[PDB]
A paper describes a structure:
Baloxavir marboxil (BXM) and its active metabolite baloxavir acid (BXA) is a first-in-class inhibitor targeting the influenza virus polymerase PA N-terminal endonuclease domain ([name]) that was approved in Japan and the United States in 2018.6 The RNA-dependent RNA polymerase of the influenza virus cannot synthesize its own 5′-mRNA cap, which is necessary for eukaryotic translation. To overcome this, the polymerase engages in a unique “cap snatching” mechanism, in which the polymerase subunit PB2 captures host pre-mRNA and [name] cleaves 10–13 nucleotides to serve as a primer for viral mRNA synthesis by the PB1 subunit. [name] is a metalloenzyme that is essential for viral replication, is highly conserved, and is not naturally occurring in humans, making it an attractive antiviral target. Despite its clinical success, BXM has demonstrated susceptibility to resistance mutations, specifically the I38T, [name], and A36 V mutants of [name].
The [name] mutant in complex with compound 23 shows interesting changes in Lys23 and Tyr24 that have clearly defined electron density. In this structure, differences in pi–cation interactions involving the 2′-trifluoro-substituted benzene ring and subsequently the position of the 4′-tetrazole are impacted. [name] incubated with 23 showed a ΔTM of 10.2 °C at 200 μM and 14.3 °C at 1 mM, ∼ 8 °C lower than with WT and 2 °C lower than the value obtained with I38T. This indicates the interaction between 23 and [name] is not as stable as WT or I38T.
Author numbering: -1 to 51, 74 to 194
Write the structure that this text describes.
C-alpha cells in the first residue's frame, strides 16, 4: 500500500512505532487499516509539536498505566478534577488538561463531537484542520500565533503530500 509507505517516509520512526504499537495492541494491522495508521501518526505528531512550546505534559503516546499515573499525579498535586477520559496534554501555565483534535471535516463538526464525548468542561478542546482552520474552548488558542501556524503548516503539508501521491481522497472520506 502507498499509504503505509508514505507514513514511514514522512513521519519519524518513534511516531510510526508508537502508532503501530497502539493499533497492534487492539489487533489492528497498520497494513489493513492504513488510513487509521496515518491519522494516529498525524495526531501524535501534533500533540508532540504542541508540547514543544515545561508548560506542557504529554499524556498522549504513553501506555495506559504510565498515562493514568501521570494524570493521577497532576490531579493530586494541582487539585484539578480527575478527567473521565485520558487527555492529550496538560498546560501548567493555565493549569488545565487539553484535548487536541485533528479533522479532515469542518472544525465545528469535530469540536462539538469531542465536547459531547468529554462533557467535562474542565478539559480544554483544541481542534485543528488540514485547511489551516482551528477551533478552541472559549476561543483561547493557548499557543502563540507562530507556534500554532507551524502545526497548521505541517498539517497542510501532510495533506498535499498525500494528494501528490493521490491518497488524500481516501483519507478525507475516512
Ligand atoms: O486515544 C486517544 O486519546 C485519541 N484517539 C483518536 C482516534 C480515534 C479514532 C481514529 C480512527 N480513524 N479511523 N478509524 N479510527 C483515529 C484516532 C487518531 F486521531 F488517533 F488517529 C483521536 C484523538 O484525538 C485522541 O486523543
Ligand atoms: Mn488522546
Ligand atoms: Mn486527541
Amino acid at each position: 500500500s502507498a499509504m503505509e509507505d508514505f507514513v514511514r517516509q514522512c513521519f519519524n520512526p518513534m511516531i510510526v512505532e508508537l502508532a503501530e504499537k497502539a493499533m497492534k495492541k487492539y489487533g489492528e494491522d497498520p497494513k489493513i487499516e492504513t488510513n487509521k495508521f496515518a491519522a494516529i501518526c498525524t495526531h501524535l505528531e501534533v500533540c508532540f509539536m504542541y508540547s514543544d512550546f515545561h508548560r506542557f505534559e504529554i499524556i498522549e503516546g504513553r501506555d495506559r498505566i504510565m498515562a493514568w499515573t501521570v494524570v493521577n499525579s497532576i490531579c493530586n498535586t494541582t487539585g484539578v478534577e480527575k478527567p473521565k477520559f485520558l487527555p492529550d496534554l496538560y498546560d501548567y501555565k493555565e493549569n488545565r488538561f487539553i484535548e487536541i483534535g485533528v479533522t479532515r471535516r469542518e472544525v465545528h463538526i469535530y469540536y462539538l463531537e469531542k465536547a459531547n464525548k468529554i462533557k467535562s468542561e474542565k478539559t480544554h478542546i483544541h481542534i485543528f484542520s488540514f485547511t489551516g482552520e482551528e477551533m478552541a474552548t472559549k476561543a483561547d488558542y493557548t499557543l502563540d500565533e507562530e507556534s500554532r501556524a507551524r502545526i497548521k503548516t505541517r498539517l497542510f503539508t501532510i495533506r498535499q503530500e498525500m494528494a501528490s501521491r493521490s491518497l488524500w481522497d481516501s483519507f478525507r472520506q475516512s
